[PDB]
Amino acid sequence: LDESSVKKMILTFEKRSYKNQELRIKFPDNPEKFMESELDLNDIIQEMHVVATMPDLYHLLVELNAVQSLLGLLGHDNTDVSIAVVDLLQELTDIDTLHESEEGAEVLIDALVDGQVVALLVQNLERLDESVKEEADGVHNTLAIVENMAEFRPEMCTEGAQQGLLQWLLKRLKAKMPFDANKLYCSEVLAILLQDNDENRELLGELDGIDVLLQQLSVFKRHNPSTAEEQEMMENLFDSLCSCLMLSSNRERFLKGEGLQLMNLMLREKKISRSSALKVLDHAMIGPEGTDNCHKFVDILGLRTIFPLFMKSPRKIKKVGTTEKEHEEHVCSILASLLRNLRGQQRTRLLNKFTENDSEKVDRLMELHFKYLGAMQVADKKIEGEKHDMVRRGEIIDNDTEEEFYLRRLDAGLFVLQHICYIMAEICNANVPQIRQRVHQILNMRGSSIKIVRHIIKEYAENIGDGRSPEFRENEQKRILGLLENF
Amino acid sequence: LDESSVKKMILTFEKRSYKNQELRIKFPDNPEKFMESELDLNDIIQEMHVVATMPDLYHLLVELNAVQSLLGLLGHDNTDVSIAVVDLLQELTDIDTLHESEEGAEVLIDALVDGQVVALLVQNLERLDESVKEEADGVHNTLAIVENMAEFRPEMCTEGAQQGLLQWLLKRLKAKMPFDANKLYCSEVLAILLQDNDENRELLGELDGIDVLLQQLSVFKRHNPSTAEEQEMMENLFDSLCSCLMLSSNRERFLKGEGLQLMNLMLREKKISRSSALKVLDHAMIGPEGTDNCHKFVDILGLRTIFPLFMKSPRKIKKVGTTEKEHEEHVCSILASLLRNLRGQQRTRLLNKFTENDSEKVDRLMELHFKYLGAMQVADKKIEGEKHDMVRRGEIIDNDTEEEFYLRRLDAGLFVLQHICYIMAEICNANVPQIRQRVHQILNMRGSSIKIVRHIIKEYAENIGDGRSPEFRENEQKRILGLLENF
């Protein structure tokens, strides 16, 4: 109960649409009451609403051209019908969220994207206005669609994204209407659009978007979110901003925005956005493309800001989760960026910072070193064991097995470990015996070999960015292992 | 005869589609003869075919949702119906080519683009295959649509272009099926897509497209087109290639393709593609972004190739039109690029070329100078007159009047004139008294003031690229007038 009892529904739906079609033609604009016929046909949307839940035979909907007509109706003179098609669409796409079956959805989705669903959605979305509680709920469900479409098959999101929605998402946030549950959701959907998608990063930037991002986070510079909903949004604005930064051209744009300045302010005043503020910084400096960003940082006393967080980490603990490797990971990586990138008069300041107070900072580095190495050492034994145990079991170590293993090293802080070794090295090739001595003086004292450190660099270098290009990749890899000689 | 006699047609058309719709549902795949009903409904397309010619009431077609359904049918299990919708679509878009009326088309078009017409066209286009003479004619008419849509409102072309068609256009040309009337047309439509559109240039390049372009022109390196149709295509491949080059990133890509090398080959063997080959070169070198391209040129004996064409221009005359300023314009501009751009060991070679044979090349430059100045002088008197005459008439000189005037100076070779003055200057700031003397020795002798030349530079500098950015613009402008002191 049932199969194809719906197929009457589909047939009925078409017959409905048609009769409406002819009726609209008969009655010229300004005919008040041809309406009941129009209203009646959308009761059948609401009925079809029930369709989703039925074990999906979604193919019915597409070959029999429900989809198309449906999409068609997203443009209708009256919004109630549009809204109705969206609302319906949410529920075939949420339920679709179910792990299985795939056949119904995989054909359905396919159809929607073939039909430029988003293009159409946004058109509707554009006219949809005035926060009539019913209108408002319409956009939300529009967004919903996207989330669901994006969650399931995250490609329709890029093409669909550009089609229009991305543009609109950008407008809504800038809107000077007060914060509401919908402004939030855009934020959710933006981040999704950018999640792992370079083209959408290029597009957002190509729309003065980073200014927008920045401004929105701007307002919360000196004072926390009023609600824990408003917070969730903030954090979505952050995730979005980072994702763009992973795209290289956004870097200059972030810089022409007072991106550093502000992330610095947010750091200088230590609540509560401090935590992500630092995660942005990391990203803005990360590559060679992070290179002006690194210089600018230093020029605005970025060093005064960062190094303290190097010497000591909070909060032990703050209920919002900013700890505790998370924090070090980003600090180190920033330092690691700066050393690799920085040159000239800014480089030198950095290095001085490593000779301060009898190279307290180098003492610090090594405290961090053993901490994380201890961690990892131990991590690895565990894995050794499970490797041996897998041979007894006769379980084959596997690409998916090595996935699970990598994560464990990461969880143990492999990434920070590298960065601190890298740094360590990067400082031992600055021709300052003080630090070189210190490092070595501390490895001796005791029980840790330099070569242990080198084994890690090589691992760091092997993978060494994942990845720009095999030219950039092997060029860098040279560079990195290059330091290993004078180390 | 008639109005809305068609509106029966529209109503009929819908009723047709519907009945087909239900019939397709009734009969499962593998039912051989439900067909007559399907065939019958497309006679009404062919009837509607007649609609276009009727004074356009095209709005009827869109509010009454002919468009949408139509678009809908671009996807149909049987191609005859698809083809039919395209063929129909050609004829509402060609006739539409008529200067007026606008109301019918402006609404129609609007609808099509709102409906992702191209996306849909290309889908059809993708399945359309096998050069069934009828299929083949289908793509052609697909292309036709685009031309017409693009001619009328050249924005739908970019968005539509990216939607899919641009991708396909790129595939078709690379296809190793022999040359035919359709391969040609793509070529026409490519060029249109790129005509004045930066995004499409970015897209083409982002698809290894320039390799394609280059290869296609590649085959005709050492030997002319077999037909004068194949020629027309070649020349479309050129126009396309140039247009991309106007986009900066295509420059490196053109370079990583052996773009120079080949355009050089095509020059070295002087037929018949020589003419455009040189026009490409110009473009590849034009800006600061032309700067590696300028260096590479010199490194491959580009100077040996270019300067001869400087000293003497053919053909006096070759029936294909490559003359006669057209040719000089490009030579000069190339030299002008090289002087502005070139530095180091390549710059010097260039300059030597200006001291050769007692600076024969400088003698040459001045021959060109007076020639073009003579031309322009005279051009300007004519305009003065019409300016005076317009005051008597009481006709106001006008932005559209200044448009007509500019063209006349251009026709008289303003652009080459600047370039040669620019060059002249660029050579008089190389600290080589020989040339500086010569220039001056020749202006004296006689009757031409240096300042006359300066007045032109300023005009050149004022406009001076149209334009990258007011920073780049006023930066350059400084540069240019900078030379005017030591001149």
XYZ file of N, CA and C in Angstrom, chain A residues 188-338:
453
model
N 24.173 29.060 6.460
C 24.446 27.614 6.458
C 24.729 27.229 5.011
N 23.865 27.671 4.110
C 23.914 27.226 2.718
C 25.116 27.798 1.949
N 25.455 29.054 2.236
C 26.705 29.609 1.709
C 27.853 28.636 1.962
N 28.125 28.417 3.247
C 29.196 27.542 3.642
C 29.164 26.238 2.859
N 27.984 25.663 2.672
C 27.891 24.426 1.908
C 28.359 24.644 0.498
N 27.877 25.715 -0.109
C 28.231 26.009 -1.490
C 29.734 26.068 -1.695
N 30.407 26.631 -0.708
C 31.832 26.825 -0.767
C 32.568 25.612 -0.243
N 31.846 24.728 0.436
C 32.471 23.690 1.251
C 33.772 23.206 0.652
N 33.730 22.618 -0.526
C 34.973 22.147 -1.092
C 35.048 22.480 -2.579
N 34.595 23.668 -2.922
C 34.349 23.990 -4.304
C 35.101 25.226 -4.747
N 36.109 25.052 -5.590
C 36.902 26.220 -6.002
C 36.172 27.221 -6.860
N 35.319 26.755 -7.750
C 34.672 27.689 -8.643
C 33.808 28.668 -7.855
N 33.142 28.176 -6.809
C 32.229 29.017 -6.020
C 32.978 30.041 -5.165
N 34.167 29.619 -4.746
C 35.092 30.540 -4.115
C 35.486 31.626 -5.106
N 35.806 31.274 -6.344
C 36.165 32.259 -7.346
C 34.990 33.196 -7.584
N 33.777 32.648 -7.593
C 32.622 33.463 -7.876
C 32.340 34.437 -6.772
N 32.297 33.943 -5.549
C 32.048 34.809 -4.406
C 33.003 35.982 -4.387
N 34.286 35.696 -4.471
C 35.263 36.757 -4.557
C 35.009 37.708 -5.712
N 34.715 37.159 -6.894
C 34.461 37.976 -8.071
C 33.221 38.879 -7.800
N 32.509 38.705 -6.677
C 31.410 39.633 -6.313
C 31.625 40.570 -5.105
N 32.853 41.012 -4.826
C 33.168 41.849 -3.626
C 32.616 41.133 -2.337
N 32.700 39.790 -2.301
C 32.001 38.985 -1.266
C 32.709 39.002 0.088
N 33.972 38.676 0.053
C 34.861 38.901 1.182
C 34.671 40.230 1.961
N 34.353 41.345 1.292
C 34.022 42.584 1.998
C 32.784 42.242 2.819
N 31.814 41.622 2.166
C 30.574 41.302 2.822
C 30.833 40.439 4.048
N 31.392 39.262 3.816
C 31.811 38.397 4.883
C 32.393 39.295 5.928
N 33.528 39.893 5.620
C 34.244 40.629 6.630
C 33.323 41.578 7.390
N 32.548 42.397 6.681
C 31.661 43.306 7.374
C 30.770 42.564 8.349
N 30.201 41.453 7.936
C 29.236 40.799 8.796
C 29.913 40.349 10.068
N 31.120 39.856 9.951
C 31.846 39.508 11.134
C 32.299 40.797 11.796
N 32.471 41.835 10.993
C 32.908 43.132 11.492
C 32.119 43.565 12.737
N 30.800 43.564 12.614
C 29.923 44.098 13.657
C 30.161 43.447 15.021
N 30.578 42.191 15.003
C 30.843 41.460 16.226
C 32.284 41.517 16.609
N 32.967 42.601 16.259
C 34.394 42.738 16.608
C 34.644 42.861 18.119
N 34.005 43.842 18.753
C 34.264 44.148 20.162
C 33.250 43.571 21.155
N 32.265 42.800 20.685
C 31.197 42.304 21.570
C 30.414 41.075 21.030
N 30.336 40.008 21.848
C 29.746 38.687 21.482
C 28.328 38.705 20.903
N 27.893 37.574 20.306
C 26.519 37.435 19.810
C 25.475 37.475 20.914
N 24.370 38.165 20.646
C 23.285 38.336 21.608
C 22.611 37.013 21.941
N 22.531 36.107 20.963
C 21.908 34.794 21.139
C 22.908 33.727 20.737
N 22.609 32.467 21.042
C 23.436 31.336 20.592
C 22.990 30.835 19.223
N 22.031 31.531 18.644
C 21.642 31.283 17.277
C 22.563 32.184 16.445
N 22.586 33.474 16.799
C 23.425 34.504 16.153
C 24.909 34.057 16.106
N 25.335 33.382 17.163
C 26.648 32.741 17.218
C 26.819 31.710 16.090
N 26.019 30.666 16.103
C 26.026 29.693 15.027
C 26.207 30.343 13.641
N 25.540 31.481 13.415
C 25.663 32.209 12.145
C 27.067 32.738 11.985
N 27.504 33.550 12.935
C 28.888 33.992 12.971
C 29.772 32.848 12.525
N 29.734 31.763 13.258
C 30.628 30.686 12.915
C 30.439 30.206 11.475
N 29.266 30.389 10.884
C 29.086 30.008 9.482
C 29.808 31.013 8.537
N 29.635 32.301 8.832
C 30.418 33.340 8.184
C 31.921 33.044 8.236
N 32.414 32.584 9.374
C 33.812 32.208 9.429
C 34.096 31.092 8.459
N 33.453 29.935 8.635
C 33.734 28.755 7.791
C 33.775 29.200 6.340
N 32.775 29.979 5.931
C 32.725 30.535 4.562
C 33.999 31.305 4.191
N 34.312 32.308 4.993
C 35.541 33.043 4.801
C 36.780 32.181 4.663
N 36.958 31.219 5.547
C 38.110 30.336 5.377
C 38.057 29.678 4.013
N 36.992 28.944 3.737
C 36.891 28.226 2.473
C 37.315 29.046 1.250
N 36.873 30.304 1.175
C 37.340 31.228 0.123
C 38.856 31.388 0.115
N 39.396 31.715 1.284
C 40.832 31.802 1.446
C 41.562 30.581 0.907
N 40.936 29.414 0.925
C 41.672 28.295 0.347
C 41.903 28.527 -1.120
N 41.012 29.284 -1.744
C 41.284 29.868 -3.039
C 42.221 31.081 -2.964
N 43.344 30.909 -3.626
C 44.394 31.856 -3.783
C 44.077 33.327 -4.133
N 43.140 33.603 -5.002
C 42.897 34.988 -5.411
C 42.145 35.717 -4.347
N 41.574 34.957 -3.440
C 40.784 35.583 -2.426
C 41.735 36.219 -1.456
N 42.983 35.792 -1.544
C 43.975 36.251 -0.634
C 44.192 37.730 -0.747
N 44.482 38.221 -1.956
C 44.647 39.664 -2.195
C 43.366 40.339 -1.798
N 42.243 39.810 -2.239
C 40.977 40.420 -1.870
C 40.781 40.547 -0.347
N 41.091 39.488 0.390
C 41.065 39.506 1.845
C 41.965 40.580 2.401
N 43.125 40.735 1.782
C 44.071 41.770 2.154
C 43.554 43.197 1.853
N 43.018 43.436 0.660
C 42.438 44.745 0.320
C 41.243 45.052 1.249
N 40.525 44.018 1.672
C 39.674 44.149 2.861
C 40.637 44.208 4.033
N 40.290 44.892 5.110
C 41.222 44.956 6.249
C 41.132 43.651 7.073
N 41.433 42.554 6.398
C 41.134 41.251 6.894
C 41.991 40.955 8.082
N 43.288 41.162 7.908
C 44.259 40.983 8.981
C 43.904 41.864 10.158
N 43.727 43.137 9.858
C 43.516 44.140 10.878
C 42.402 43.667 11.772
N 41.296 43.322 11.157
C 40.152 42.913 11.912
C 40.438 41.604 12.626
N 40.957 40.589 11.955
C 41.151 39.339 12.702
C 42.049 39.643 13.877
N 42.920 40.628 13.714
C 43.794 40.977 14.809
C 43.026 41.625 15.943
N 42.195 42.583 15.592
C 41.384 43.205 16.590
C 40.682 42.093 17.395
N 40.003 41.196 16.688
C 39.241 40.126 17.316
C 40.092 39.272 18.258
N 41.363 39.108 17.908
C 42.329 38.466 18.783
C 42.679 39.341 19.981
N 43.023 40.601 19.712
C 43.446 41.528 20.757
C 42.391 41.586 21.878
N 41.125 41.691 21.498
C 40.044 41.619 22.466
C 39.607 40.168 22.520
N 39.964 39.479 23.594
C 39.867 38.030 23.608
C 38.519 37.453 24.010
N 37.492 37.728 23.221
C 36.243 37.005 23.340
C 35.419 37.248 22.099
N 34.494 36.353 21.776
C 34.611 34.920 21.948
C 35.046 34.425 20.575
N 34.873 35.318 19.610
C 35.280 35.169 18.228
C 36.777 35.030 18.062
N 37.542 35.363 19.097
C 38.994 35.138 19.072
C 39.358 33.808 18.426
N 38.658 32.754 18.801
C 39.043 31.414 18.375
C 39.114 31.182 16.843
N 38.046 31.543 16.136
C 38.004 31.446 14.671
C 38.882 32.512 14.008
N 38.838 33.722 14.540
C 39.687 34.794 14.082
C 41.085 34.303 13.810
N 41.574 33.442 14.681
C 42.909 32.903 14.548
C 42.921 31.852 13.471
N 41.836 31.118 13.334
C 41.766 30.117 12.281
C 41.752 30.829 10.900
N 41.073 31.958 10.783
C 41.157 32.670 9.538
C 42.640 33.001 9.275
N 43.254 33.708 10.218
C 44.614 34.160 10.022
C 45.453 33.063 9.441
N 45.515 31.939 10.142
C 46.188 30.757 9.595
C 46.017 30.618 8.073
N 44.768 30.473 7.639
C 44.414 30.298 6.238
C 44.916 31.410 5.314
N 44.917 32.636 5.794
C 45.230 33.756 4.944
C 46.706 33.758 4.696
N 47.463 33.129 5.590
C 48.913 33.135 5.426
C 49.470 31.880 4.808
N 48.638 30.872 4.556
C 49.169 29.501 4.479
C 50.194 29.261 3.370
N 49.921 29.671 2.154
C 50.855 29.294 1.070
C 51.873 30.351 0.699
N 52.551 30.165 -0.446
C 53.217 31.292 -1.087
C 52.226 32.416 -1.340
N 51.026 32.095 -1.776
C 50.025 33.149 -1.923
C 49.677 33.841 -0.613
N 50.113 33.265 0.509
C 49.898 33.889 1.803
C 50.970 34.916 2.111
N 51.765 35.229 1.104
C 53.037 35.866 1.341
C 52.930 37.363 1.603
N 52.034 38.081 0.962
C 51.920 39.483 1.337
C 51.249 39.528 2.664
N 50.264 38.658 2.808
C 49.521 38.548 4.044
C 50.439 38.312 5.249
N 51.419 37.437 5.084
C 52.453 37.311 6.080
C 53.214 38.613 6.328
N 53.584 39.342 5.287
C 54.339 40.572 5.511
C 53.479 41.596 6.185
N 52.215 41.634 5.842
C 51.395 42.723 6.306
C 51.206 42.472 7.765
N 50.929 41.216 8.083
C 50.758 40.793 9.460
C 51.853 41.387 10.335
N 53.088 41.141 9.951
C 54.201 41.644 10.740
C 54.170 43.157 10.824
N 53.810 43.810 9.736
C 53.768 45.252 9.730
C 52.686 45.796 10.629
N 51.758 44.979 11.053
C 50.766 45.551 11.937
C 50.899 44.972 13.348
N 52.124 44.606 13.698
C 52.396 44.029 15.008
C 51.720 42.680 15.184
N 51.500 41.988 14.085
C 50.945 40.680 14.182
C 51.755 39.812 15.113
N 53.059 40.070 15.201
C 53.916 39.241 16.047
C 53.616 39.393 17.544
N 53.349 40.624 17.933
C 52.966 40.905 19.283
C 51.746 40.097 19.634
N 50.895 39.835 18.650
C 49.607 39.199 18.935
C 49.745 37.696 19.004
N 50.480 37.166 18.046
C 50.560 35.745 17.858
C 51.396 35.047 18.948
N 52.552 35.615 19.265
C 53.552 34.881 20.017
C 53.171 34.571 21.453
N 52.532 35.530 22.097
C 51.901 35.239 23.341
C 51.058 33.965 23.274
N 50.230 33.831 22.240
C 49.395 32.636 22.143
C 50.314 31.474 21.898
N 51.480 31.745 21.347
C 52.431 30.689 21.262
C 52.884 30.265 22.638
N 53.347 31.214 23.433
C 53.927 30.886 24.736
C 52.915 30.219 25.694
N 51.647 30.577 25.567
C 50.649 30.041 26.467
C 49.298 29.953 25.779
N 48.602 28.853 26.036
C 47.310 28.577 25.436
C 46.211 28.466 26.480
N 45.011 29.115 26.157
C 43.954 28.940 27.163
C 43.114 27.720 26.825
N 41.945 27.574 27.442
C 41.516 28.411 28.549
C 41.391 27.528 29.770
N 41.238 26.234 29.520
C 41.253 25.244 30.583
C 40.089 25.358 31.568
N 38.862 25.508 31.071
C 38.557 25.521 29.643
C 37.302 26.351 29.375
N 37.154 26.794 28.133
C 36.043 27.664 27.738
C 35.051 26.776 26.995
N 33.778 26.878 27.364
C 32.759 25.919 26.959
C 32.614 25.853 25.450
N 32.719 26.995 24.785
C 32.821 26.985 23.338
C 34.131 26.270 23.046
N 34.156 25.424 22.024
C 35.321 24.586 21.814
C 36.382 25.217 20.944
N 37.434 25.695 21.595
C 38.585 26.255 20.909
C 39.879 25.542 21.286
N 39.774 24.364 21.885
C 40.947 23.716 22.458
C 41.108 22.266 22.029
N 42.329 21.753 22.127
C 43.454 22.488 22.721
C 44.643 22.383 21.784
N 44.714 21.302 21.034
C 45.561 21.316 19.874
C 44.958 22.268 18.846
N 43.650 22.233 18.638
C 43.081 23.101 17.615
C 43.866 24.405 17.651
N 44.063 24.938 18.849
C 44.663 26.262 19.007
C 46.131 26.320 18.642
N 46.889 25.382 19.187
C 48.293 25.232 18.833
C 48.503 24.938 17.362
N 47.672 24.071 16.799
C 47.792 23.736 15.404
C 47.848 25.039 14.652
N 46.949 25.965 14.966
C 46.867 27.142 14.130
C 47.998 28.104 14.407
N 48.447 28.137 15.642
C 49.515 29.051 15.982
C 50.779 28.603 15.258
N 51.194 27.379 15.545
C 52.328 26.818 14.852
C 52.268 27.047 13.321
N 51.151 26.670 12.724
C 51.032 26.708 11.288
C 51.264 28.131 10.846
N 50.759 29.086 11.610
C 51.010 30.466 11.275
C 52.502 30.733 11.332
N 53.168 30.271 12.380
C 54.588 30.543 12.507
C 55.305 29.885 11.355
N 54.924 28.646 11.101
C 55.454 27.866 10.006
C 55.250 28.600 8.652
N 54.111 29.230 8.477
C 53.906 30.025 7.272
C 54.909 31.156 7.228
N 54.979 31.891 8.313
C 55.805 33.068 8.368
C 57.250 32.727 8.125
